[PDB]
Amino acid sequence: QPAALPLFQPQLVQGGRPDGYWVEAFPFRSDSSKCPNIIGYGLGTYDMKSDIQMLVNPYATTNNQSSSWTPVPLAKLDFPVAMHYADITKNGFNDVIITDQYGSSMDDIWAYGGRVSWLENPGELRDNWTMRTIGHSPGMHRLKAGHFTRTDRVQVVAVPIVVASSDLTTPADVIIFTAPDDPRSEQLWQRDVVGTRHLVHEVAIVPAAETDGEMRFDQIILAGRDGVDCLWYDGARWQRHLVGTGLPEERGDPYWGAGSAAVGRVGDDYAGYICSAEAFHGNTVSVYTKPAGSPTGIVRAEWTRHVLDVFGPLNGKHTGSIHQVVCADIDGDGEDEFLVAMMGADPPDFQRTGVWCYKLVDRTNMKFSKTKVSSVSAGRIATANFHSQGSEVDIATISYSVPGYFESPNPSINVFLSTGILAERLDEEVMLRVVRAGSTRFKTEMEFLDVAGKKLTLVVLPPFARLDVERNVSGVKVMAGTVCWADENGKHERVPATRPFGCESMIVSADYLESGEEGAILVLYKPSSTSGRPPFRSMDELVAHNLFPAYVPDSVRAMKFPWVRCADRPWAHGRFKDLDFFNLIGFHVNFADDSAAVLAHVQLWTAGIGVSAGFHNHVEASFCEIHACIANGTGRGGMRWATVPDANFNPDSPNLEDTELIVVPDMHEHGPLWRTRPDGHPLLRMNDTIDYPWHAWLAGAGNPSPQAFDVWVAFEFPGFETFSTPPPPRVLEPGRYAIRFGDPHQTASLALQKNDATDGTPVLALLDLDGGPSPQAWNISHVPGTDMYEIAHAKTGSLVCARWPPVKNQRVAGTHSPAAMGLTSRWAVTKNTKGQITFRLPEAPDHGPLFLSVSAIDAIPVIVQGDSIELSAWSLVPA
């Protein structure tokens, strides 16, 4: 699975700003990177100093209720530009390093300005921090902290863009400032100039710790008129390595080379590529690549420039829309994507406003795709996990707005919170949009409802991911994919529906569970101490509480979920009067991708002692339902279904002798009660509804003194194939095999014609020969929630599929477009005494069995037929 991008929940951090320029993820403490604060500000003007605002992260404090980011002004400065942070005082709190006194533009550089200073973090939320001067250089414009020549002091690389008003040709000093031993006294730091460069517009840092032992010290990557280059100190001296020269010079235009550059990790190499925007404020996005089998890192490789995109011509002043690039692992796959900060344009163009996310889609040819992730001005991007402890990467932006120069409407700071789940209000219910679990690399958890002693939580798990739980207490109900856990009785697996008429505990007996190869989506039932405890003697004891986290929309946070007597619902139509029978709604789970497909609808129910929810059969709306009992009032509450024909049972005055009872104890889920074919496909009524016998939840019988409510959850799935009737014996371990027909004397093996991945490619049996092209390998996997198997070509992934229609002598082909419910590409498996395997299609209620077969006893066409068992016995040989 290539990784898909996560979703993003937008949130306005600060709107209505007079201007904007810089945004920075600022961790308040130097021992923690998670939920940092945001600092933002603009360039100011001659009429207004710029407030250096630290916006306090409301999510940082565990158990938070607020989504409001409180601004705390650290300073009020004339013409600030760039900033970074480091623990200067070495006391566990990050200090701010900032440049100011720049002037109002490149044509108005303060000759005595270009100051670099630091702001002492006082270890608590207070405004107006103590500020001390580090040094000065006119035009001072970018800076980063790090360890460049030593590791026992903070050091700062600082670089002016120009040296003087309107001077676009004189190079500027690249300066390293070194903290003194006591930075709270002294004043003016040690300074050393380590190079001169033209129009440097970005400084990027590669921390030594990123380089897996290649570098003792941090590398400085500069993007300016000279192109992109890397400076580093190696214990002995400074060296330089040219990455490339960027945009060629154009006559009458003072900007060439690069405007920004960032270093992109691919797998094991922190520098698998280097991306760049060109030139100063330009419209060109390029990437630098090195040849296959290069050393890791930057300085040992030869780089080559490739232009990816030109977003349009420059204006009269030779500028465009791109302000910055940054690299970050947005989709969690171990490769950095890169983000491009698009300021906006005049005339307005959405293509040049917001953030583009570029993704390396082919490591071999170094091909990238791009996806728009925001369409409001970004003059700068900050990345961090702003909302949780996980390895997700959120994106913060600030609009680019400089009054009387280039102003964006409504300048604002925004944050886009990476998530596998977005919540939105319908009317009385919530739509929960989820990523496909198979292609996400992040765990997402969202608590939604505190009810009946549990915090019901929606949980998206990537493939083979772990979820820690409270052993013997936490419960799970899977809605897509699979999870499993192990205990002394071996492996336990859970899927959307257990076996027909079956019952399974939802309780996890282990300390953790893991998703299988497709990931999982599930409801996790955490224990709660804030929604009552059983026995529930009244609906008052069962009041439910909205648990949505503070970053979900306000309209969802404000929702209540009352229990409503079923008599009072708009669908009662005069029924259920005077019954202790209650309903709580409700939650749709749909895929967030372009299918928008339903996953499940979820609602809750209760029934007092002696109460029946009423016999029904779902002729009104089609779905496959599973119930999970949270609390069983008497121990005897559960599902009954009629075992007689529909015509022979009266749901209004039920004869309970013509029913069977499946008791559903506390924290158990029951299996399907709908009608199925022998291989698990659902029977269907003439109006396209899943066919059910008459059935109902009924509480244990007796007198409600004292009262004790059943509480249960309905999961309404779209139609799917479930398990088989009767259950077949297990005879085949999934794995990778050659699939052979014939005697020890001369075999043919199953083959996809020419290994061709094209839909419709014939499947054949190739004579195995000494000349000896060897057998094609097939992956055989169990289809979860069924007793069926699929056969997928190991090289191309093509599924073994009968062509339509599945009839005697029908041809077999490879496909990635199977029929729904895998009708012609799923197989019932049996083993004879010779230990050969037969694969049989789902049997049409019409016809006889049809087996995967050879067409005769150099290539033999492969077919389905059920006349001859001889032609459909295969040997499986591990490959």
Residues of the binding site for ascopyrone M: 21, 102, 106, 141, 201, 281, 323, 400, 405, 613, 625, 627, 712
Q: Show the site string, 642-661: x = touches its own copies by CB under 8 A, - = not.
A: ----xx----x---------
Burial (CB count <10 Å: 0-12, 13-18, 19+), residue 122: middle
Annotated binding site: 21, 87, 89, 91, 93, 95, 102, 106, 141, 201, 281, 323, 329, 331, 333, 335, 337, 400, 405, 613, 616, 618, 625, 627, 695, 712
Instruction: Specify the DSSP class assigned to residue 682.
Output: B
Annotated binding site for Mg(2+): 87, 89, 91, 93, 95
Give the rounded distance of the alpha carbon of 28 from its chain centre: 27
| Residue 276 CB coordination number (10 Å) | 32
Residue 790 CB, shortest distance to Zn ion, in Å, is 26
Return the number of the residue (101 or 853) whose C-beta is nearest Zn ion: 101
Binding partner of 585, given Zn ion, Mg ion, its own copies, none, CB within 5-8 angstroms per partner class:
its own copies
Distance between CA 704 and CA 812 in Å, rounded? 62
Distance between CA 509 and CA 491 in Å, rounded? 11
Residues tagged active-site: 141
Residue 814 CB, shortest distance to Zn ion, in Å, is 22
800-819 positions binding its own copies, by CB under 8 A: 804-805, 807, 810, 815-819
715-744 positions binding its own copies, by CB under 8 A: 719, 721
Size of the site for Zn ion (CB under 5 A): 5
If one asks whether residue 269 binds Zn ion (CB under 5 A), the answer comes out as no
Binding partner of 93, given its own copies, Mg ion, Zn ion, none, CB within 5-8 angstroms per partner class:
Mg ion
Residue 156 CB, shortest distance to its own copies, in Å, is 32
Binding partner of 472, given its own copies, Zn ion, Mg ion, none, CB within 5-8 angstroms per partner class:
none
Q: Show the site string, 574-613: x = touches its own copies by CB under 8 A, - = not.
A: xx---------xx-x-x-xxx-x-x---------------
Residue 27 CB, shortest distance to Mg ion, in Å, is 11
30-59 positions binding its own copies, by CB under 8 A: none
User: Is the omega angle on the peptide bond into residue 784 within 30 degrees of 0, that is, cis?
Assistant: no
Q: Point out which span in 266-274, 286-294, 427-435, 767-775 binds its own copies (CB under 8 A).
A: 427-435
676-715 positions binding its own copies, by CB under 8 A: 677, 681-682, 684-689
If one asks whether residue 447 binds Zn ion (CB under 5 A), the answer comes out as no
Residue 147 CB, shortest distance to Zn ion, in Å, is 27
Distance between CA 98 and CA 120 in Å, rounded? 11
Q: How many residues does the chain have?
A: 879
Residue 528 CB, shortest distance to its own copies, in Å, is 21
326-355 positions binding Zn ion, by CB under 5 A: 329, 331, 333, 335, 337
Residue 625 CB, shortest distance to Zn ion, in Å, is 5
If one asks whether residue 346 binds its own copies (CB under 8 A), the answer comes out as no
- Report residue 794: phi and psi, to 5°: -70, -35
Distance between CA 197 and CA 644 in Å, rounded? 88
Q: Under 8 Å CB-to-CB from 709, ≥6 apart: which residues?
A: 535, 536, 537, 538, 539, 542, 580, 582, 606, 607, 608, 631, 633, 699
Return the number of the residue (236 or 621) whose C-beta is nearest Zn ion: 621
Residue 147 CB, shortest distance to Mg ion, in Å, is 15
Amino acid at 245: T
Binding partner of 662, given its own copies, Mg ion, Zn ion, none, CB within 5-8 angstroms per partner class:
none
Residue whose token pair is 């130097």: 30
Q: Under 8 Å CB-to-CB from 857, ≥6 apart: which residues?
A: 742, 870, 871
Distance between CA 545 and CA 456 in Å, rounded? 10
Return the number of the residue (219 or 865) whose C-beta is nearest its own copies: 865
Beta strand segments in 290-349, E: 304-310, 322-328, 337-343
**Do residues 272 and 329 lie in contact, with contact meaning Cβ atoms separated by under 8 Å?**
no
* From candidates 266, 308, 314, 431, binder to its own copies by CB under 8 A: 431
Distance between CA 442 and CA 460 in Å, rounded? 8
Instruction: Return the closest-CA partner of residue 261 out of 305, 228, 307.
Output: 228
Which letter, b or e, does each residue of 441-471 get, where b requires 16 or more Cβ atoms within 10 Å of its Cβ? bbbbbbbbbbbbbbbbbbbbbbbebebebee
If one asks whether residue 555 binds its own copies (CB under 8 A), the answer comes out as yes
153-192 positions binding its own copies, by CB under 8 A: none
Annotated binding site for Zn(2+): 201, 281, 323, 329, 331, 333, 335, 337, 616, 618, 625, 695
Return the number of the residue (160 or 549) whose C-beta is nearest Zn ion: 160
For 586-589, the CB contacts below 8 A with 24+ separation are 586/428, 586/429, 586/430, 587/429, 587/430, 587/432, 587/448, 587/449, 587/458, 588/426, 588/429, 588/430, 588/431, 588/432, 589/432, 589/434, 589/458, 589/479, 589/521
Return the number of the residue (91 or 375) whose C-beta is nearest Mg ion: 91
Binding partner of 333, given its own copies, Mg ion, Zn ion, none, CB within 5-8 angstroms per partner class:
Zn ion
Task: Report residue 454 as tokens.
Answer: 């549990």
Binding partner of 733, given Zn ion, Mg ion, its own copies, none, CB within 5-8 angstroms per partner class:
none
If one asks whether residue 348 binds its own copies (CB under 8 A), the answer comes out as yes
Annotated binding site for 1,5-anhydro-D-fructose: 613, 616, 627, 712
* From candidates 234, 428, 470, 517, binder to its own copies by CB under 8 A: 428
Q: Under 8 Å CB-to-CB from 47, ≥6 apart: which residues?
A: none
Instruction: Return the closest-CA partner of residue 611 out of 539, 693, 673.
Output: 539
Distance between CA 721 and CA 500 in Å, rounded? 11
If one asks whether residue 848 binds its own copies (CB under 8 A), the answer comes out as no
Beta strand segments in 632-775, E: 638-642, 659-663, 668-670, 695-698, 710-717, 735-742, 747-752, 761-767
Residue 402 CB, shortest distance to its own copies, in Å, is 17
Return the number of the residue (90 or 565) whose C-beta is nearest Mg ion: 90
If one asks whether residue 509 binds its own copies (CB under 8 A), the answer comes out as no
Q: Under 8 Å CB-to-CB from 409, ≥6 apart: which residues?
A: none
Residue 59 CB, shortest distance to Mg ion, in Å, is 23
Distance between CA 517 and CA 507 in Å, rounded? 22
Q: What is the DSSP string of 163-227?
A: SSTT--SS-EEEEEEE--S-TTSS-S-EEEEEEEESS--EEEEE-GGGGTTS-SS-EEEEEETTE
**Do residues 24 and 38 lie in contact, with contact meaning Cβ atoms separated by under 8 Å?**
yes
Binding partner of 49, given Zn ion, Mg ion, its own copies, none, CB within 5-8 angstroms per partner class:
none
* Helical (H) or strand (E) element with 228: strand 227-233
Binding partner of 91, given Zn ion, Mg ion, its own copies, none, CB within 5-8 angstroms per partner class:
Mg ion
* From candidates 251, 573, 745, 834, binder to its own copies by CB under 8 A: 573
Query: What is each CA distance from 474 to 460, 479, 511, 549, 723, in whole angstroms?
Result: 16, 16, 9, 20, 26
Residue 573 CB, shortest distance to its own copies, in Å, is 4
Binding partner of 87, given its own copies, Zn ion, Mg ion, none, CB within 5-8 angstroms per partner class:
Mg ion
Binding partner of 622, given Mg ion, its own copies, Zn ion, none, CB within 5-8 angstroms per partner class:
its own copies
Q: Point out which span in 12-20, 189-197, 236-244, 726-734 binds its own copies (CB under 8 A).
A: 12-20
- Report residue 540: phi and psi, to 5°: -60, -40
**Do residues 413 and 402 lie in contact, with contact meaning Cβ atoms separated by under 8 Å?**
no
Q: Show the site string, 270-299: x = touches Zn ion by CB under 5 A, - = not.
A: ------------------------------
User: Is the omega angle on the peptide bond into residue 805 within 30 degrees of 0, that is, cis?
Assistant: yes
Binding partner of 89, given Zn ion, its own copies, Mg ion, none, CB within 5-8 angstroms per partner class:
Mg ion
Site residues for Mg ion per CB under 5 A: 87, 89, 91, 93, 95
In the complex, the residues that contact Zn ion under the rule CB under 5 A are 329, 331, 333, 335, 337
